[model samples]
Target chain A: KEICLDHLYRGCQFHLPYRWQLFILPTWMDFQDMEYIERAYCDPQIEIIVIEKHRINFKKMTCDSYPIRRLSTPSFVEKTLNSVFTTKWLWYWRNELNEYTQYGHESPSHTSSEINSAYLESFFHSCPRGVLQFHAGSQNYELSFQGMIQTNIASKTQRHVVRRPVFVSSKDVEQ
Target chain B: KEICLDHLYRGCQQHFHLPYRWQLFILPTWMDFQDMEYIERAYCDPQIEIIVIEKHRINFKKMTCDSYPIRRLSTPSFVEKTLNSVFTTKWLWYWRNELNEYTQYGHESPSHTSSEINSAYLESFFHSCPRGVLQFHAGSQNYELSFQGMIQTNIASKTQRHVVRRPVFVSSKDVEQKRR
Candidate 1:
């Protein structure tokens, strides 16, 4: 509501269309369901009708047929996930699709939830003005945690560096 | 030279006019000689010719030169003395703008002269001294409510701090630039 009220003087389109939505689901769940349906239960030659309103540019002449419009996740929930996650799995793609995208592997369909979430997260962060950043405390905490892990590994490496040299073989007795 | 250079940018007449005439003297020494010379040798018999060339106004203008038995002890000596002295006399002279310019045309107020640069010092003036009813002491010594200036209703404030309420395009340049 605070974000919405601040943006009231902007466009009606900017206001989050969340007044009457019944349930909200996470994007990962949608991706999992799409994979299952496409692989198992769905018909191969399906004739799903495309609605005109869901077209990429609904009333415009330059509309593309492949891409379709979908409802956006609200800024409030997006900000909440940014605040809560350390590695940002919400944005980090559960280590699969994001890792795969680096090597140029395409998803089953272009509008898969996995592909959509990555694009959405990138768009949310890339805006030049008025985008949320991780709070200073959280960023500091992440640094401290990473430092601790590095310190542990460094201590082990130093111990290996200073390992005692093998002496002449002896009958060890101080067990 | 340094003194004249500083005041050269000040005014054309302020460049000390020290071009040609040679023999320069001091002030306390002048006072002693004024007493001795007035009593003894100089102008007691005198219709000491009043030259219009040294008149306060040789041209049509506002001018008075009576408090004028003075040549300014220059900036280097003035500054050296001020740096060496207990009190500030160099800036006191610099602030006293009329001391060099021949006429007694009174120093301009610092605010009136420096309105451009003075504004930066007063940037936070409204925050520190916001417009509101000030409690006052009338002659009877009771507290009287008095509004000294206009009440400012428009100010941006979060719970923790104030912010700029209006959109302004700020750019890196000279300090005086701000676009609304």
Candidate 2:
């Protein structure tokens, strides 16, 4: 007698999974407060379905002859997250083609040297960073950052991130 | 098989067979409008339900005049049907008793003639009959008067006499019609 494994599995499940394909980036809090983050990450009720890191290529970019080259290094993941969480004006870009596409001062067309030089001088002033992109394929979508977690951080930190697999209303690529 | 009258008679078959003991009184509207005194006699809904006419007799032996005269006269049987149909204070009383008994006037003993008179005066005032006692009763009970029913002229002429039905709630004796 064979048992139905399909019925047992809830979410996206497969018999054989690839290694590099499954990249789980540690959150800034996870890196800063590892113990608390780990505890919350393992909570039964909380689900930290996905985590991603901001990536930058040094080889293709110009850093020499730039005044504040360090500011352009793209460690602004925390700032990006903060902006996404706090501001109501931030728009969540939803699409595979435009997820990492830079907007405002961070446009790729700008000379890396010029961007790098001006970045630190205008650090105090507001500059757009990476946005949390949500996608529902090509058309239908909704996005919110403050509503990311249903519970407060203090209590959620104690509970393990439980995985109750759910079916996605719309399919889209997750990065 | 016995056929159940349940389907034929809706709810209670008793109500269908119940004799309507209601009396109907028809008075002309002009007669009610002209003579205020006779109008007062038939005005109130409760007055219509129970009518009273006081007849005074002098006591020569006692050497004292009765401040209050005799008890209410028996309402005439001939006029009973006409009065019941035309008079509606009974209905008003029934309504107050059924629906708004909570807000009804407080109970007072009908011990003295003056007190009973005061009660009737208060009831008249409550029913909005300040000057015209008969019309006041009719208006309060929602009864209409026609013109042709004005047969008597004596009570109809004394329009200035402001008389109040002394007892607030009319007694059963007061309502009984005297056979002529």
Candidate 3:
């Protein structure tokens, strides 16, 4: 969080993260990454936003469902989700389990990706021909159909998990 | 073992959470900038009414663990662009200062920094997860359902913790984006 930095230096107290939210961040323009973000957050504004010459034979799942442009803060559903589905202070990686799995919750890491793989996969599936068109910084890039996955297939253990990503990608923190 | 994506679109990244770090950002049209703020600060949290004009149920129990949705904005002026477009007077002075303004983003000018966008992206992941209904069983008590399935808590007992199901609904411009 760029804004997060300003608060720290003012001698004001703030909760710190495992690593500073910015560790080599400003971390260049993950050119490809930006394209994906614009597509996710803001649809690339263009001349022809898909004046398709032909129609495809399938149902499309519009990212329109999750509308980031309309995003707000937290809610009770989220809180309830946190209580039952996860531990306190859990966002990404598997950081919260070791400390907050206090309710004796047996399952860990299984739930993170089910909704995720579904959501992520659905977003991709909705695209035209499964290709992503993002226009960031006046540049347009086409991210063709890739695959989908649920990171850290922890069918067995949660200790050994790994990191992976995608385009039209979900941001960290799911940006 | 749950990072949640295919391969190589991104590199190895870490996931961590603090209290809900509230960031402000520009929304894609249909609604103005400040209006987005109003909805964000107001409705997104402390969900109000939930009217299910419809309800559906199938044998379900596919739980998923997801973080608060993540994002590392690529555009510095995603804010600036939004403001310039919104052309609103109240916002022009808000976040022009740019990101990472707090710690070492620049001058530590908290007042000038405009806004930051959170990770809750679009997927319509469930503007409303029907399966996400919070139903407190151990029925012996009574309750009633209202709009969209809003119900009074079955708090008949004090020291009781029931698996309460609360569906979340975000109020905003539900716009559909198409390809160009």
Candidate 4:
């Protein structure tokens, strides 16, 4: 019903991303890396455009269910993203991940962008892993990477793997 | 014996505050306000130069780490006037003199100087984190009042020891230029 995208666009800039895919950061990300992404938002060279055109519906997984922002770069600044996202922190916006799940712990809709947004927003409160780098490429938004990961305390490895992009139909996608 | 002045002067810059006193924010500060101050950490506000020139010594109050929602509070003029009145006139003179004493000298006065006498007094104003919540129970009554996910302030906790980093702040423009 009501969507609040103002948090994504604090200064009221009208630049939207061309195309972007979400990636979860590893839990081992250091503090210095977090500062880089936080600071990277202000960098002029990085064409990091954020857009929240649709309100993502948690239950339905609709294209426009709840407000979501995507980070993308123009071809000119594509290289910068490699360094920026690799640092691990992204521009933080106040979101209600815990408030939504306080009644019960419900997993995010793997079929939609809800899963990506959940992990992205809650990264700081709960140092997380899996999704990293929002890649800007021409493809359908991927959801295959969304799921529970197994971690062995005795032997540590990059548990959550990134598979090939699986395209899903959406109004947000360019025809 | 050594004072770790290196933390205070990273990047080898010589800019320090002119005159400022410490103010402890109350527990009632809300999430939105905390966002502002945290973001405002980068804002060019002279009075809000949050610095820990001296590393605080925190003692374990409880066996395990406790989670507290970090919040900011306001010290509006009207509320401050009421507090000054309640604390009594003698209390007012004591603080006023202390303020004058700091102003007469300067924050950067040499350690061996008489001005250094108030350094401990100034340091006392800053409460050690996590344990600082103890000071909150000192007293409370407000006709008007308002205010983490759980922030782990415990030094021994993995979240504090490994995950949480001491945030380094620079003016937002500096970051922009640095990336240039």
Q: Estimated TM-score per prediction?
A: 0.12, 0.10, 0.16, 0.17
Candidate 3 per-residue lDDT, tens place, A1-175, comes to 1111010011001111101111121121111222222233221111122212321111121222211111111111111222211212111222234422211122354332222333323433222124333322222333333321112222312332111212121122233
Candidate 1, DockQ to 2 decimals?
Answer: 0.00
Q: Which is the better candidate, 2 or 3, if ranked by TM-score?
A: 3
List candidate 2 stretches off by more than 4 Å: A1-175, B1-64, B71-77, B82-87, B91-102, B106-180
Computed on C-alpha atoms, the DockQ of candidate 4 is 0.02
RMSD of each: 36.0, 41.8, 22.8, 23.4
Clashes of each: 0, 40, 43, 17
For model 2, the local distance difference test gives 0.19
- The interface RMSD value for candidate 2 stands at 45.1
| TM-score of model 1 vs. true structure | 0.12
Give per-residue lDDT, candidate 3, residue A152.
26
The chain A TM-scores for the candidates, taken one by one, are 0.17, 0.15, 0.18, 0.16
What local lDDT does model 2 show for residue B35? 26
Q: Local error of candidate 3 at B157, Å?
A: 30
Compute the lDDT of residue A9 as modeled in candidate 2: 14
B50-136, model 2: which lDDT tens digit per residue?
233343222212211232111111111111112231112211111112221211122321321111122333443322211122232
Superposed on all Cα atoms, model 4 deviates from the true structure by an RMSD in Å of: 23.4
- Alpha-carbon lDDT, every model: 0.19, 0.19, 0.20, 0.22
Deviation from native of the Cα of residue B81 in model 3, angstroms = 3.3
User: Which candidate wins on lDDT?
Assistant: 4
Regions of candidate 3 where Cα sits further than 4 Å from its true position: A1-52, A56-175, B1-78, B82-180
